[PDB]
Amino acid sequence: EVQLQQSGPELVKPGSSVKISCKASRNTFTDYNLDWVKQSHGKTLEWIGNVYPNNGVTGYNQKFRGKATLTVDKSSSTAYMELHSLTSEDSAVYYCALYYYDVSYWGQGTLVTVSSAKTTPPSVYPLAPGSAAQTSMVTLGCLVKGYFPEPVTVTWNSGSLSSGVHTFPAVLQSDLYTLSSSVTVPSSTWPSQSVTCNVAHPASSTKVDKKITPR
Amino acid sequence: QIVLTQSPAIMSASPGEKVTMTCSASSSVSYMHWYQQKSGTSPKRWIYDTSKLASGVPARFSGSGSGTSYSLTISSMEAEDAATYFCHQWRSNPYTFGGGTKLEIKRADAAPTVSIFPPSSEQLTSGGASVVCFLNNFYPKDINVKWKIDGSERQNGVLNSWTDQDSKDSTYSMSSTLTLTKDEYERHNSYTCEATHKTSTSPIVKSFNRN
Ligand SMILES: [Ca+2]
């Protein structure tokens, strides 16, 4: 019934600060709290602190003293976390989570990347089969090469293809990321119908479409 | 701070069988919370106050324990339960989480579907040449990929990536990308990706001739 919308991913220079936000959709909750949680390397979770927007005090984790400052805007009840004097150790996904007795709702996370490197949009290349192969299914792909920072999101036919899709985790090599995505479809549906990969890179505000054409 | 220690870090469970994982606390706590995180999703509270199910959680999940020892149990493991589970306590300031238990499910062995792709014409103009090999929907997760250019093994210049266990069909997939310079790409003719997997005594070979 309630959804939390976090602000978008951030690329921050070492030494700078960043302020990320978390807003809950319409509700009549009274004594609810919002917790902030750091997930490093897609694995370990750390509780940073929390707030009670309908006036309560703020909880802090002493491990983050001088690193995180939690506030709430009274007007909108939007929650904010400012991260200070950033280093590479602060690169992580930061989640906001709302708790109200027997219900809980987590935001989608905000990826913060701390780096001196600049934004580079991906080069998106369609992968069509070579000479041939022939089965009942055909596998197509899209190579999403040489971007920074994370994330990118990939869809196929704007979401109309999903069950046959595998989008692989990005890998970092020499300060740029590369990922690939594959989609498998019946041989009777391609090339007779269009197949297109859609690649979004929020850091460059790009949404690139590449149609897969037979070689 | 109260430190939470989970066991096991990773486990493979038979479908339909009982699964148990535990969380040990460095000091007693009144209650323990559990969270599920599926691939590419936020954590979600799953069991709260030791034994209470969150909204939407099915009956096969339960939680138990007291003092310093807590458990999360699945009465009958299903494919959709493959995920990482974290315990979380609210007694101490600060709150803390356990390191997680990564749960995978067993299924019948499945051979990878292997597909090789030449560099796109678009990439070649940039002076790079990536040859991509997908190895899709295999089980078990242990697999090895070898590249060959004109019959000779190439080890350097390869980027591999692996998916987590699929929630629906319980398989794994892999991508392997060999990136050469365009000039080196055009010096050789034959490009091959070979998959070694327990489902076949001989590796699965996909190849193409630069033509
Ligand atoms: Ca309110």
For residue B98, what are its two tokens? 């356990």
Name which of A89, A110, A91, A86 is nearest A17 in CA terms: A86
Which residues are A71's β-sheet partners?
A80
Residues A99, A24 within the same domain: yes
Residues A106, A6 within the same domain: yes
For residue B37, what are its two tokens? 């995180």
* Phi/psi of residue A125, nearest 5 degrees: -120, 130
Final residue before a domain boundary, out of B84, B107, B130: B107
Residues B25, B48 within the same domain: yes
Name which of A178, A196, A133 is nearest B117 in CA terms: A133
Residue count of chain A, please give it: 215
Distance, CA of B176 to chain centre: 16
Final residue before a domain boundary, out of A66, A101, A116: A116
Which residues are A176's β-sheet partners?
A173
Residue the block writes with tokens 């929390």: A50
Final residue before a domain boundary, out of B77, B107, B137: B107
H or E element: which one contains B122? helix B121-124
Domain count, chain A: 2
Task: Answer for the pair B63, B25: CB distance below 8 angstroms, yes or no.
Answer: no
Residues A128, A40 within the same domain: no
Domain count, chain B: 2
Query: What gap in Å lies between CA A144 and CA A208, rounded to an integer?
Result: 10
| Secondary-structure breakdown of chain B: helix, strand, coil percentages, each rounded to the nearest 5 | 5, 50, 45
- Tell me whether residues B113 and A173 touch, CB distance under 8 A: no
Tell me how many residue pairs between chain A and chain B have CB atoms under 8 A apart. Answer: 128
Resolution of the structure in the document, Å: 1.6
Final residue before a domain boundary, out of A116, A140, A173: A116
**Domain CATH for A174:** 2.60.40.10
The alpha carbon dihedral of B64, B65, B66, B67 has a sign of negative
Count of CB atoms within 10 A of residue A27's CB?
A: 14
On the question of a cis peptide bond just before residue B140, with omega within 30 degrees of 0, the verdict is yes
Residues A95, A189 within the same domain: no
**Domain CATH for B161:** 2.60.40.10
Query: What gap in Å lies between CA A40 and CA A89, rounded to an integer?
Result: 9
Count of CB atoms within 10 A of residue A85's CB?
A: 11
Amino acid at B17: E
Residue the block writes with tokens 């060959």: B148
Final residue before a domain boundary, out of A53, A86, A116: A116
Q: Write out chain A in H/E/C secondary structure.
A: CCCEEECCCEEECCCCCEEEEEEECCCCCCCCEEEEEEECCCCCEEEEEEECCCCCCEEECHHHCCCEEEEECCCCCCEEEEECCCCHHHCEEEEEEEEECCEEEECCCEEEEECCCCCECCEEEEECCCCCCCCCEEEEEEEEEEEECCCCEEEEHHHCECCCEEECCCEEECCEEEEEEEEEEECCCCCCCCCEEEEEEHHHCEEEEEECCCC
Query: What gap in Å lies between CA B14 and CA A184, rounded to an integer?
Result: 28
Residues A85, A161 within the same domain: no
Residues B119, B195 within the same domain: yes
Query: What gap in Å lies between CA B129 and CA B142, rounded to an integer?
Result: 28
Residues contacting residue B1 through CB under 8 Å, at least 6 positions apart: B92, B94, B96
Residues A154, A86 within the same domain: no
CA atoms within 13 A on the CB side of B67: 2
b/e per residue A135-162 (b: at least 16 CB within 10 A)? eeebbbbbbbbbbbbbbbebbbbeeebe
Query: What gap in Å lies between CA A180 and CA B160, rounded to an integer?
Result: 10
Residue count of chain B, please give it: 211
Residues B119, B74 within the same domain: no
Residues B10, B93 within the same domain: yes
Largest CA distance in chain B: 69
Taking the Cβ of residue A208 and every Cβ of chain B, the question of whether any pair is shorter than 8 Å is answered with: no
Residues B15, B101 within the same domain: yes
Residues contacting residue A193 through CB under 8 Å, at least 6 positions apart: none
Going from the C-alpha of A11 to that of each of A118, A148, B14, the distances in angstroms are 8, 9, 43
Residues B102, B123 within the same domain: no
**Domain interval for residue B40:** 2-107
**Domain interval for residue A176:** 117-215
Query: What gap in Å lies between CA A70 and CA A58, rounded to an integer?
Result: 8
Name which of B129, B142, B41 is nearest A42 in CA terms: B41
Task: Answer for the pair A99, A53: CB distance below 8 angstroms, yes or no.
Answer: no
Query: What gap in Å lies between CA A43 and CA A41, rounded to an integer?
Result: 5
| Residues of chain A found within 8 Å of residue B175, distances taken between Cβ atoms | 166, 168, 180, 182
Residues B9, B44 within the same domain: yes
User: Which 109-168 residues of chain A touch chain B by CB within 8 A?
Assistant: 109, 123, 125-131, 133, 137, 139, 141, 143, 145, 163, 166, 168
| DSSP state at residue B141 | S
Residues A124, A108 within the same domain: no
Residues A32, A11 within the same domain: yes
Residues B100, B132 within the same domain: no
The residue of chain B nearest to residue A215, with distances taken between CA atoms, is B120
Query: What gap in Å lies between CA A75 and CA A53, rounded to an integer?
Result: 10
H or E element: which one contains B135? strand B128-138
* Phi/psi of residue B124, nearest 5 degrees: -55, -35
Name which of B186, B3, B206 is nearest B95 in CA terms: B3
- Tell me whether residues A131 and B209 touch, CB distance under 8 A: yes
Residues B66, B163 within the same domain: no
Residues B100, B117 within the same domain: no
User: Which 30-89 residues of chain A touch chain B by CB within 8 A?
Assistant: 35, 37, 39, 43-47, 49, 59-63
Count of CB atoms within 10 A of residue B168's CB?
A: 9
Residues B120, B206 within the same domain: yes
Residues B88, B140 within the same domain: no
Residues A112, A36 within the same domain: yes
